[PDB]
C-alpha cells in the first residue's frame, strides 16, 4: 500500500508530455486550448505533490479561470483558420 503513490510525479511528467503533444496535434485550436487547460491541471497537481497547493489553487483561479476563458472568448468571436497537421507540410521538421 505504501508505494502505490510513489510514481505520481513521473505520471504527471508523462501526462504533461502527452498534453503538449496533443496541443501541437489538435485539429481545432479550441481543442488545443482545452489541452492547455489539462496541462494546467497537471501542473497544479504536481504543485500539490511537492507541497504548494496554494499555488495550485492560484493557478486554477487565474490561468484556467481568466486566461483560458479569454482564449475561448476570442476563438469564439474571431475567424482563425487552421492548416491540419500534415506529413506533406511538417515532416521536413
Amino acid at each position: 500500500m505504501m508505494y502505490l503513490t510513489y510514481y505520481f510525479i513521473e505520471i504527471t511528467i508523462f501526462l504533461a508530455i502527452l498534453c503538449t503533444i496533443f496541443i501541437i496535434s489538435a485539429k481545432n485550436p479550441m481543442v488545443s486550448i482545452l489541452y492547455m487547460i489539462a496541462l494546467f491541471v497537471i501542473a497544479a497537481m504536481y504543485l500539490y505533490l511537492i507541497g504548494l497547493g496554494i499555488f495550485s489553487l492560484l493557478y486554477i483561479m487565474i490561468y484556467i479561470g481568466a486566461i483560458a476563458v479569454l482564449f475561448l472568448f476570442i476563438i469564439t468571436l474571431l475567424d482563425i483558420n487552421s492548416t491540419e497537421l500534415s506529413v506533406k507540410s511538417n515532416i521536413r521538421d
Binding site: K88, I91, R92, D93
Partner: protein, 179 residues
C-alpha cells in the same frame, strides 16, 4: 613546442564538420520555400555537408602539418590553413581565377587572424592594462609595453645589426685622437 597529432585532430575535424553540415542542411530544409520532406535534406542542400567537411579537414590538416613542418606555432600556419580552406571553397566555382583569389584572400585573412593571436577574444594577461606599463625604473629589461628614456646600445646593435650608420661605438669617440 609540442607536436600536433594531425590525423586525430583532422578526424575530429571531419566529424565536427559533418555534424555541422547536417545541422545546416536541416535548418535549410525547414527554412526553405518549396515543397520539401525528409528526403530533401541531402538532395536539395547546396553542398553544405561537403562545404563544412572539406573546410574543416583542410584547415585542421594544413594547420597541424605546417606547424609540424615549420616546427613552430605561429600565424603563418593559419595563413596556410586559410589558403587550403579557400582553395576548397573556390574549387566549387569551376573557374581558375576565382579559385586563386579565394585561396590568396582567405589565406591573407586567416593569417591576419593568426597574426593578431588566433583569437576573437583577448589574452587578458598580455593586454596593456594587466601588464607592466610606463617607464621602467632602474636598469631593468624593457618589456613590451614599457617605455624607456635611454636604451642600451648593445641591444640596438643586436636587434638592428652593424652597418648603415649603427655601430658598436660612436664615431667621434672611436676616431678621437688618443691625447
Amino acid at each position: 613546442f609540442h607536436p600536433y597529432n594531425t590525423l586525430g585532430l583532422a578526424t575530429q575535424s571531419a566529424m565536427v564538420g559533418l555534424g555541422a553540415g547536417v545541422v545546416a542542411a536541416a535548418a535549410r530544409n525547414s527554412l526553405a520555400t518549396g515543397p520539401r520532406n525528409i528526403l530533401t535534406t541531402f538532395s536539395k542542400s547546396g553542398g553544405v555537408v561537403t562545404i563544412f567537411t572539406g573546410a574543416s579537414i583542410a584547415y585542421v590538416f594544413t594547420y597541424c602539418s605546417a606547424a609540424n613542418l615549420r616546427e613552430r606555432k605561429d600565424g603563418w600556419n593559419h595563413m596556410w590553413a586559410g589558403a587550403a580552406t579557400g582553395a576548397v571553397l573556390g574549387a566549387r566555382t569551376k573557374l581558375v581565377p576565382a579559385f586563386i583569389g579565394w585561396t590568396v584572400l582567405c589565406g591573407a585573412a586567416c593569417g591576419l587572424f593568426g597574426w593578431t593571436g588566433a583569437r576573437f577574444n583577448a589574452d587578458r594577461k598580455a593586454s596593456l592594462e594587466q601588464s607592466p606599463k610606463g617607464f621602467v625604473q632602474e636598469d631593468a629589461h624593457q618589456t613590451f609595453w614599457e617605455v624607456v628614456h635611454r636604451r642600451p646600445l648593445s641591444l640596438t646593435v643586436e636587434q638592428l645589426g652593424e652597418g648603415r650608420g649603427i655601430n658598436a661605438v660612436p664615431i667621434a669617440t672611436a676616431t678621437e685622437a688618443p691625447n
